[PDB]
């Protein structure tokens, strides 16, 4: 799961293209603060399952 509002965008831009090559399912949600609440932090760039 990749946040859409990560700044700078250069840190997660390759993740869709890397996951596309390895056939790893990936989704992009809205809010790096929403992800951070899952892991009890202010923000969270990416979360995997």
């Amino acid at each position: 799961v990749i946040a859409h509002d990560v700044e700078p965008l250069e840190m997660v831009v390759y993740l869709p293209y890397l996951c596309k090559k390895l056939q790893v399912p990936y989704c992009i949600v809205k809010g790096k603060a929403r992800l951070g609440q899952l892991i009890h932090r202010s923000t969270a760039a990416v979360v995997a399952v």
């Binding site: 965008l9 250069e10 840190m11 390759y14």
Partner: protein
């Protein structure tokens, strides 16, 4: 490792993705003040390489500098010189724009130490760098055995003496050997040593 992809991605600066993002960043820095603090580095891969650590006492400053060349500062372009020195245009600064920008940031923030700097972008007029600065009087920096070298007295205004990587390259310290015979341990110190006329106490 995430940062082995960012480094590979950052080498494709002519790609559409990086060109568009640099366009937005270069536009934004054209309106903000010339020297100002940014919250986090815009190139964390390159910032981490040059010594930035996300800890207290490490700050990032953005500086905008007018790239290109400038005329020789003589009134109305009039110099009372021989035709060998009668050039006004086409003369280039010895120090790189990165070294010049590092000194402007260091002068602005006299109480911090310039660690290193890198390149953000450029346009037809400006070039934007980012300067990694360290507070030498932070308790974290003082107590770090791997970093408290920056708390030495001799490191006061590093960039103005020529100790940073950007300012050391403009001194000629980019390699070793027969190509760098005149920049052995300092270009001006080397010349003084060779020109010394040694007069021993007992001489013929």
């Amino acid at each position: 490792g995430a940062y082995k992809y960012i480094n590979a991605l950052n080498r494709k600066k002519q790609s559409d993705v990086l060109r568009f993002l640099r366009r937005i960043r270069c536009w934004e820095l054209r309106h903000l003040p010339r020297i100002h603090r940014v919250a986090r580095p815009t190139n964390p891969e390159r910032a981490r390489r040059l010594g930035y650590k996300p800890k207290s006492g490490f700050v990032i400053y953005s500086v905008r500098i007018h790239r290109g060349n400038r005329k020789v500062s003589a009134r109305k372009g009039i110099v009372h010189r021989k035709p060998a020195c009668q050039g006004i245009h086409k003369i280039k600064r010895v120090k790189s724009l990165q070294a010049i920008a590092e000194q402007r940031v260091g002068k602005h923030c006299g109480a911090l130490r310039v660690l290193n700097s890198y390149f953000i972008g450029q346009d037809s007029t400006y070039r934007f760098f980012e300067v990694i600065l360290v507070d030498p009087f932070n308790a974290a920096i003082r107590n770090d055995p791997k970093m408290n070298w920056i708390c030495a007295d001799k490191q006061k205004r590093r960039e103005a003496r020529g100790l940073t990587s950007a300012a050391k390259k403009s001194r000629g310290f980019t390699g070793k050997g027969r190509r760098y015979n005149k920049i052995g341990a300092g270009a001006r110190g080397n010349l003084k040593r060779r020109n010394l006329l040694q007069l021993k106490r007992y001489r013929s």
